A paper describes a structure:
Ornithine decarboxylase (ODC) is a pyridoxal phosphate (PLP)-dependent enzyme that catalyzes the conversion of ornithine to putrescine, a rate-limiting first step for the tightly regulated biosynthesis of polyamines (putrescine, spermidine, spermine).1−3 At the molecular level, positively charged polyamines interact with negatively charged RNA, DNA, and phospholipids, thereby directly contributing to chromatin biology. The ODC enzyme is a homodimer, with the dimer interface forming its catalytic site from residues from both monomers. The X-ray structures reveal that covalent adducts with pyridoxal phosphate (PLP) are formed in the active site of the human ODC enzyme, as verified by their preparation and enzymatic testing.
We then turned our attention to the inclusion of the 5-membered pyrrolidine analogs. Compounds 10, 10-R and 10-S had ODC IC50 values of 0.36, 0.21, and 0.10 μM, respectively. Like that observed for the piperidine derivatives (7-R and -S), the IC50s values are only slightly differentiated favoring the S-enantiomer and in a range similar to that observed for APA. To help verify, we have also prepared 10-R-PLP and 10-S-PLP and found that they both demonstrate inhibition of ODC enzymatic activity, with IC50 values of 0.16 and 0.03 μM, respectively. The activity still favors, as observed for 10-R and -S, the S-enantiomer with 8-fold relative activity. In each case, as we saw with APA, the adducts 10-R-PLP (2.9 Å resolution) and 10-S-PLP (2.0 Å resolution) were formed, forming trans-oximes with PLP. The lipophilic cyclic pyrrolidines of 10-R-PLP and -S-PLP, form strong lipophilic interactions with Tyr389 and weaker lipophilic interactions with Phe397, the pyrrolidine rings orientated in an orthogonal manner relative to each other. The basic pyrrolidine amine of each makes a H-bonding interaction with Asp331.
Author numbering:
A (entry chain B): 6 to 298, 310 to 422
B (entry chain A): 1 to 298, 310 to 422
């Protein structure tokens, strides 16, 4: 089974070269299903980079971003924590041998039976942001260590009047007092700035707000020690606001509001940072139409779409950039083109308009940075199966993973 | 009510005097004093049989080929196969599903106009001869991978009033249709008919008339080039519930005179359709549990309810199918009871996983149930397990008389 099958990446070869090779091998096979190449070594590189940029912050990987068992196994060997949102994710993490103290149940609104599942399996730390959640915890997991999730302002959000998660400071005070009444232990504070962060100062504000709630806890008699700064960090360099800019703004704020001598323990919940760039998707052009506007335009149909990997266009506000597998000659002509998914849906369209050389059925298109919120949310609408994932890892990357295990 | 063994093929008896609603009530009452309150469906296969009887009555000249993609539940396909419908399959997996249930290939149309070559090869290997197409490259692929196929030319329609527009993506113009027929003649490929799709969620029935007229024209084009055209495929778009402005019978009352005018029976034409949501929409009712609750003060009281199904699950139809969902209470509320402005949210971490932005509901509590009717079409077929949340259990029910009706259809 390919789930736990990993291939060697030879010296001097990158995931890109492996992609080229696999494509050339099937040139006349006629079996040209879409497929992923996933470089686990890129995940190890991301971990080293995190250790360098955020030395005070323990990463808890957000399983929901991509729950591939190979990914979770690699990260567990690396020694990260895991942020789990449901019973199934907890089951996945524990099946790989991760002890419960490396799991945070960071879902603020949890079904009671799933809270009980967490309690049965020793997962003690959970987040919350409402009084009803406190009632549920008191009845189903009374010895849990609760982390109060506070609200953060996203000025760019589509729905700004109705925020799904996060308590205001005013509500946070009442929640701390209520938890004290119910004899429930609150041990920290969490927040989530969001993937669509444009200004790193948002983090500063969140950290400042977190400190405020910490002070409230001290007033009510809690011994607060856990600060969870959430996720939202970029997973590729193809972004305006790069990881290191964010961390360069975060670390002084952490030192100012949560100095190390205070005894605070700082964690994060990065999802896309670890996995986005590790996965590259190859889709095959399965159909083609030429529309005359005599300026020629083209419609290409590929065998992955908005019901599959490209659901990220709708759910994750993703902007995907098609890349050519075979290097184009410098002089060849480009045409206005659209790219469509395989399903019956007229809205199953990947790219409305782009410039491409004339391509043919059987040619491949590549999409980089497809690791995050792509396969995790794919469906089998129309009966189309999920692309196979080929995991690769070089020898030196495996050695680095061994060093992390030691 | 509890499934034992396989969910797919387990069916429960629906006793005399009971409706699917009563089964929902019973299931809810049965788990009233426990903490396992996962979301679940009640699927009344008898409603599907009723829909088939209604179709036979309203469109006696049109053989239905069920659009498997709308809801690919094995129980649904088995019931319809026993009923004797055809099947419209969009991929190798759907063909596999239909054939596994024992349906012969002549009751399958591969009505995907833009097919991967290996899937065309699969269709050829398993005797599925009839496929649609709307482009020259498709003719090349068929000539190379399925040369003996019977092709149905899919034409464009003005579906501007339809809820789900398909014509931007699929369908040849009449001008293109002439060239496609001539090209098919060059390649020695047999074109046997014409198909169209007015668009899912049709709002104006006159579209069908024009579509049928266009089909007649293409038929005539085929006759000019030497094809003997006999198959007319009028697609889908029919409503699946009575909760719509444009009801099934108005559409069929517009379709039947057009069929008689442009395709009289004495011509030898064979007329089929590809209804998806018509057969299954109202057969499924979804019950979700309120798993979390927040009170927001405006003191005008407002409420946020969190349930254990969402936009990544069954309610993906809000995004993909332009669905407008109406939450229903298990017990019809007393007239005097106070209502509050309320929002309904899915279980996932996503801030946009929101089912209902604003509605009026009495104050509800964790453990209460909400019902969503007419959830059969384009709901489970496109659900994912994002965040690790599992698909709702489906409980299939069927009364004795419904089974008798199915037996009559099978004979
Ligand atoms: C509570 C919590 N923790 C971590 C993450 C992961 O965020 P990343 O940006 O680092 O991956 C999340 C993510 N929550 O929502 C992001 C969704 C919204 C659309 N697709 C991604 C989280 O909620
Ligand atoms: C070719 C073809 N045949 C039948 C159907 C079924 O249409 P119904 O309206 O009868 O269910 C279709 C539908 N195709 O896309 C409609 C999807 C898109 C979003 N949700 C519905 C079809 O294409």
């Amino acid at each position: 089974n390919e789930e736990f099958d990993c291939h060697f990446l030879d010296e001097g070869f990158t995931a890109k070269d492996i992609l080229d090779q696999k494509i050339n091998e099937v040139s006349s096979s006629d079996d040209k299903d879409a497929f992923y190449v996933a470089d686990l070594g890129d995940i190890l590189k991301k971990h080293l980079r995190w250790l360098k940029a955020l030395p005070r912050v323990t990463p808890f990987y957000a399983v929901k971003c991509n729950d591939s068992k190979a990914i979770v196994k690699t990260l567990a060997a690396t020694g990260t924590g895991f942020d789990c949102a449901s019973k199934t994710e907890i089951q996945l993490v524990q099946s790989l041998g991760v002890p419960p103290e490396r799991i945070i149940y960071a879902n603020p609104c949890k079904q009671v039976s799933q809270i009980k599942y967490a309690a049965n399996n020793g997962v003690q730390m959970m987040t919350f942001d409402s009084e009803v959640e406190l009632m549920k915890v008191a009845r189903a997991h009374p010895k849990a260590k609760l982390v109060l999730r506070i609200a953060t302002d996203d000025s760019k959000a589509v729905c700004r009047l109705s925020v799904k998660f996060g308590a205001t400071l005013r509500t946070s005070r009442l929640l701390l007092e209520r938890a004290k009444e119910l004899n429930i232990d609150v041990v920290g504070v969490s927040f989530h700035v969001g993937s669509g962060c444009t200004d790193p100062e948002t983090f500063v504000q969140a950290i400042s707000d977190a400190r405020c709630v910490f002070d409230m806890g001290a007033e009510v008699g809690f011994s607060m020690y856990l600060l969870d700064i959430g996720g939202g960090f970029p997973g590729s360099e193809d972004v305006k606001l790069k990881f290191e800019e964010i961390t360069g703004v975060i670390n002084p704020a952490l030192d100012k509001y949560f100095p190390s001598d205070s005894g605070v323990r700082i964690i994060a919940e990065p999802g896309r940072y670890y996995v986005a760039s590790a996965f590259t998707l190859a889709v095959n052009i399965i159909a083609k139409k030429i529309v005359l506007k005599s300026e020629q335009t083209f419609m290409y149909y590929v065998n992955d779409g908005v019901y599959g990997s490209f659901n990220c266009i709708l759910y994750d506000h993703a902007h995907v950039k098609p890349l050519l597998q075979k290097r184009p000659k410098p002089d060849e002509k480009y045409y206005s083109s659209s790219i469509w998914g395989p399903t019956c849906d007229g809205l199953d369209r990947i790219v409305e308009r782009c410039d491409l050389p004339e391509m043919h059925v059987g040619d491949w298109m590549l999409f980089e940075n497809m690791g995050a919120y792509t396969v995790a949310a794919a469906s089998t609408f129309n009966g189309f199966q999920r692309p196979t994932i080929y995991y690769v890892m070089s020898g030196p990357a495996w050695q680095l993973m061994q060093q992390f295990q030691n």
